[PDB]
Design a protein around this nucleic acid. Sequence first.
DNA 1: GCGGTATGGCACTGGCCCTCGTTTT
DNA 2: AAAACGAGGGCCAGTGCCGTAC
Lengths: 358, 363, 983
Amino acid sequence: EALLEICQRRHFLSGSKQQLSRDSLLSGCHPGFGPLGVELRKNLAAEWWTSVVVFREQVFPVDALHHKPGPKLRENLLHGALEHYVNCLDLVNKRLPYGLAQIGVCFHPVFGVKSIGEKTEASLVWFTPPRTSNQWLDFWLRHRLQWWRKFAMSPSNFSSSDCQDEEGRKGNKLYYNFPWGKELIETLWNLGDHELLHMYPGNVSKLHGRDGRKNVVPCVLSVNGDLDRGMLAYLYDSFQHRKVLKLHPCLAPIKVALDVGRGPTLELRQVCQGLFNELLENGISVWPGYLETMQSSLEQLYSKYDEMSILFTVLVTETTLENGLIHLRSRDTTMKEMMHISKLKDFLIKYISSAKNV
Amino acid sequence: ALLEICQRRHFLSGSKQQLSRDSLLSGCHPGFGPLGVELRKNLAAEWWTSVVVFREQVFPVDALHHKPGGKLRENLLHGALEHYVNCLDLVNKRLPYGLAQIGVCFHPVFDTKSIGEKTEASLVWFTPPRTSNQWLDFWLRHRLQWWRKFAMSPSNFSSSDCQDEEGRKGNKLYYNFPWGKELIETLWNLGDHELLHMYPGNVSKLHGRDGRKNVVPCVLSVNGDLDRGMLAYLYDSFQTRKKNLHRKVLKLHPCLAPIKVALDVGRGPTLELRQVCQGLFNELLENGISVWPGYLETMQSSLEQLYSKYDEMSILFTVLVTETTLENGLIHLRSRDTTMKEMMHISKLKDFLIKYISSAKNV
Amino acid sequence: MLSRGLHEQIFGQGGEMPGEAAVRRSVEHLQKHGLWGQPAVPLPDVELRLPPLYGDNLDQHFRLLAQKQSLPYLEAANLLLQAQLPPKPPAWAWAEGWTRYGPEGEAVPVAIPEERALVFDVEVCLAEGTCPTLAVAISPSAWYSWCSQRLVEERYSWTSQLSPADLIPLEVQEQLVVGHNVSFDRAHIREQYLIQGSRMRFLDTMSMHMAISGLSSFQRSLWIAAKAISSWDWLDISSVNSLAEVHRLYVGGPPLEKEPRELFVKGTMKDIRENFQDLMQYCAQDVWATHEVFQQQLPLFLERCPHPVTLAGMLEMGVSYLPVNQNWERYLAEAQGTYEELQREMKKSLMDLANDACQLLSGERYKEDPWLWDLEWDLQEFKQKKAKKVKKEPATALGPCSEEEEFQQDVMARACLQKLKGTTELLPKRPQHLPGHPGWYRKLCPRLDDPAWTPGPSLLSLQMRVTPKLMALTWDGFPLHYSERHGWGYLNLAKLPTGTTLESAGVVCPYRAIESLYRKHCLEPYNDVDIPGCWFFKLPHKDGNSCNVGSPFAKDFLPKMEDGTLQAGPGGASGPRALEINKMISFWRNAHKRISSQMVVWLPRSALPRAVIRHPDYDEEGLYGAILPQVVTAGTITRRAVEPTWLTASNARPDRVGSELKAMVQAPPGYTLVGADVDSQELWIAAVLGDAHFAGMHGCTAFGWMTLQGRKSRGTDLHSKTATTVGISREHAKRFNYGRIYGAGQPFAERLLMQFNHRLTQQEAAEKAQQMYAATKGLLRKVQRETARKSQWKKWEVVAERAWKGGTESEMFNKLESIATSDIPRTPVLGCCISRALEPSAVQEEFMTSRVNWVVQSSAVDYLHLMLVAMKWLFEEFAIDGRFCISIHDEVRYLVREEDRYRAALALQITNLLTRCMFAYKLGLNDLPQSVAFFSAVDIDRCLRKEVTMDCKTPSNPTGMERRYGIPQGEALDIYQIIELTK
DNA sequence: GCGGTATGGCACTGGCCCTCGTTTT
DNA sequence: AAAACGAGGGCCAGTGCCGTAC
Ligand SMILES: Nc1nc(=O)n([C@@H]2CS[C@H](COP(=O)(O)OP(=O)(O)OP(=O)(O)O)O2)cc1F
Ligand SMILES: [Mg+2]
């Protein structure tokens, strides 16, 4: 709709005129991403790795090869995690069931001639005994659903479906309502030991891990989420005469932007540079609109900063060079406020830290 | 050339015996271990911090791994060059400005027929022709400075001034491995040739405001192999005469170190208020510091064993929780740089770790 | 042509003054000495139309010039002397700008205090400087108090604008400002930073005090100790340069009170306004005391320094000017970055060595370490007190699953954790340093509650006394030590006994690892104490040392580090590299404060010469500004310049970090600096003081002939002739000669020449004995040389003859002592007496060397003044734009423009010629040699430096940065006359 | 029989004064 | 419960070596 056009003028996506359709975006075919989309994906992947690093006991990060080891590109992100299974058995001391998480750029064929598409997906291979495989699968189902639910503006938009077959005893797929069509966002399967037993026969005496004075070949849980589809999901979830993207604070790429109000004066640039350094010193993404070079209107400026999903806009007028007061302006409430420049850092940090809840 | 056993025992690399210098320098290695990919993670993050974030006019770019028209990309420079116009639109034609990206590249290699992939962090710096060489020297000095820190011996990393076949100036960065120097990062000043070839029609969409006039941007480029860099720091961390007493430990910089602290349980056995360890664990990971859990263990062995086990993993501090700490509140601590027992408080330990890393980042 | 060297001059037709007997004695002297192998190489004579002389001699020329150049300022000073003082106001006005206090101390709002002359002392809050905040100035008419814009609470942004105090009056005579350390106040003047100007000059009471009754640093050291038989008679006739002290000296009134809180340097802007009235009062007391002191000093100074040349010379010497731009800020940033990097590397290596050496604490294995056994090695674990009770021991008091139903057990463990946390805080008190680590390691760490805490062991040094012993091997030995001196180095049988006993309890001292280390060293008390290196057992004593001071630590022994002995381990070339790192940042370590804090005011595009704007340079949004060097006009000795930063500014070395500091003073576009360096001044001065005393001509001495014989251009000077003996070129030979003139001590010349030549002591001693011929000879029981033909006699009464003393043969030290024996002014020529504390009247005086040095260096400073007034005389008379001066003792650089540079260099040559002719005339005859009349090197370029070609370290590429090049000069500048119409 | 004239910095040290715990109404 | 004395760390100035220039 009118969302795909505000992602072009605000550089969420790459420059395109024909491959800007929803079908091409759902496809791996690209025209990749603009800086905003890249930062959004990086924050998303960071929160993904954070939502699995808090998980007890221990999950080890790995990286798989992209091409075929014997000469070709990878489709799934399971094989490379299965290759490092026997190795990562030593680090866990073969003690308990354990997993391996990894985020990578996987490929898939897209159909004149046919081409190839890319997608950045995050996978988790959870090795666990067959008797406690299904329960842990339901566990991961709940935790992943809640994971998508946290940063969501609406929990009803994300759905969870159950399924099964002959190869997979029980599997679950996480869908997302658009609502132009519910789409796949993440797959959760419960593959048997067959996949692992196929690449190590044998003598298979290495594969079985200890499970309380018991030797047993572990069943394999296949978690596989898409961060591109997730990015688009949150983008469509944030789209709200107003055209403002209300992305989650912890997820939003740029969370603050500061310009000047008084005419082009060096001192204003000095103060703004100071605030720039102070805000970047505490890990706060800030857009520098004080460069500037003209500072035309304020309404189209706020419109631009709202289409870029900036949490707070800051204005450094000439009064700031006297009292230190500065012009804040929210996004979710769009309230024109004013506060001292020294208490800005603490306010932003506290506001970001207050968004940490489940 | 014997620390490999330390890399296999504690997985900073693969456990395969076939890990020759060629196999590691070509990028044909089966893959890095968890500690290795974590080390590379923190190294790449430290790149991203001291290249993209602090310096304005630099924005992240997402280049694809292939071409729409099988072989892949050899460098992530071209894909960044493709995003020149839009990134010019978001900067309002204010050059100099750059595009940075950390992506894995694929290099064809004829083993004397295979293909070796390796992670590379590249930055393409679009700069006016009037100040091309100045920015070249600037980035040379700053990249070299970025690589000379974190090192226990900065004298190994060197730079070389070299010219192109046409005459274009450029600089290479080397690290002194035990078998000789090796290229780890390359800097070149491309004379706006490729950009002219990419946009033959309208060259008006390429003009960037130098200040009082719009000019055709000269294309600077710096590509840094983070795999060879990770191996370089991995070698630099490891120790060499009349020391009279030697211990096995790799001294990685506290910033890029894979696992920061290591929590364990002492005395031993003690049940069952050991749930405090979980508290300290989540409290630690909440602040973003890596903590190794020493709960479920088969040892039950000499303290020297797991101390050396932690020093082989370059773990900064070893925090020990015993029953006396359960009584008062003063846990034990053993630094890696200087093996010495030290008592400390809990939240004081947290803030000590945070301040340790934060100040380590500084001078 | 003629008389062995003279040029065509119109400075007096006669003249000889032949002195046939005298020149016969000189020729006979120079024959037996003996030098009679003349090279006969006539220098190219120059024929040019000299500027108009005023007559009769050049003495009255320079006198009239100096008088007319300093007449208005003398009038103004006289207006200050006969000034009737109006009383201090009852209250100070709290308003921005100037406030005039006239009748009954009323407040009259004024922008600029229009006065002929006034006293001045500015104030500045150091907490957020260097911007002026307060000022007080009294005048022969009324009082004035200036307040800065710091009266309104704002969040200012200091980029050093034109905020400093305004003092100069507009046109569309004239000014004189006196004050204690007047240069500092000058640096806070709004109109002194402009490229053009200025009519306003300054008079320093500190410099004046130094000229009248000054004293040496050695005298200062024991003057303040007042809290060598007749060395305490000058204690009450002179004083230190402090304001309270100089006031207690020249006024002798009640002791002025100083600020007890030091609020301008200790406190912030907040606590200043709270005590504004008081601080204003203090400033008023300061300017008042300064006024009194000035009033009492002016006639005294005029008496002791009768010649106006010194006056005008002191007037122009105070108005220095250094033009700069953004490249200054770039220089600061780059140099500081480099410094922080090298320091980071060094401290990283050292702390790495300190960390891996901390492991040998367990168990008691440090006692075997031949380097690490002197220090603490402590093990603390304190402390706690009992509060829990009673009578029970607190020291001893594999199942697989998948549970998650206890979702809130995490917050249970959290609650347990926090509840456990806040119950131990009251057990200790003040967080001490880490007790687990040894004492030597505790001292080598920053405090935990320190705002600038860095991880691990910091404060590593270089140049400490722990770390050098921590690693370094010691001169073909193993241990190094310190007690009264560190490891002995640089700056008929003898035996010494030995001993070894135990008694308990002292620290254990190993001496087997030492012997074994010596074994390992040679694997590739006596004997081996002379030339080889070895350490004994205990004792401790010298037992074979050359230096009588010691050297903690060896920081300038690179050739004695890159030749084998000595080296370090572990290990390799880490030693010489560490020494290199030390040598690189040696300058920036002891100057970075003075350089970074060195303020600079930027002038906008509205207050600069538009003729520069017309010049094809802006440059690209570039900021142009300047800084006044802030120099004390006259400091001992003799009345030389004294400046904290720019006088000790390092030269252009490819080794030092901030070595570019000298070449950062970049002249504005359209302008260029033209300067010159006197070659040579003090040598030729001594020469003249010899030949003029011996006879009439200039080449009638053994020493005074070689000075004016060599040419630096494709030739060999006297310094260069002594440097090619060999010999070491060239500054070293200069510091050998000039050190020989002012006391050629045998052991000093020994260790010096041996330090510079690097050889063996015997041949060196032979060379010295060969060179000691110059000072030889000299003069009941006594030295076997008197006025009688023989010393041996029987009961011969001659106590009336033991009053004469003087050397013989080559040198002329007899005259330098002749000026050092007079109990009367001793002022040659000119011609100004100094210090009632060094004058042998009522002084022992036992300060001979300082007085010889006083003579020759005063000749040098009067030379400087003469150069100044001469350069000023033909810069205003002719169309030569840019009169701003930048002088460093011998060298002097003027800020001219690109179209008047050659004529300015010509002015320099003329100046040098006239000054040389002055020194020649003041002793006779007016005739002067050839290879000494004109400058040999005249630097003409954008930034000032040493040689015309300049390389550097920090920016690596000099011309790579926006620079130009230099031009040697020369003989080609002798074609552009002083007249405007040239070329 | 004595190099001189200046400017600074850093490390080391010991004495002044404060604080805080230990010992004491 | 309440008064007193010794141990620890910071602010202070002095001293010993070194840094540079002219
Ligand atoms: N160690 C020194 N003692 C000195 O008294 N001087 C005196 C101080 S002033 C006078 C000028 O110093 P310079 O470095 O210019 O030495 P110079 O003039 O004799 O020789 P040149 O002109 O620089 O070639 O020499 C110099 C020294 F290096
Ligand atoms: Mg000189």
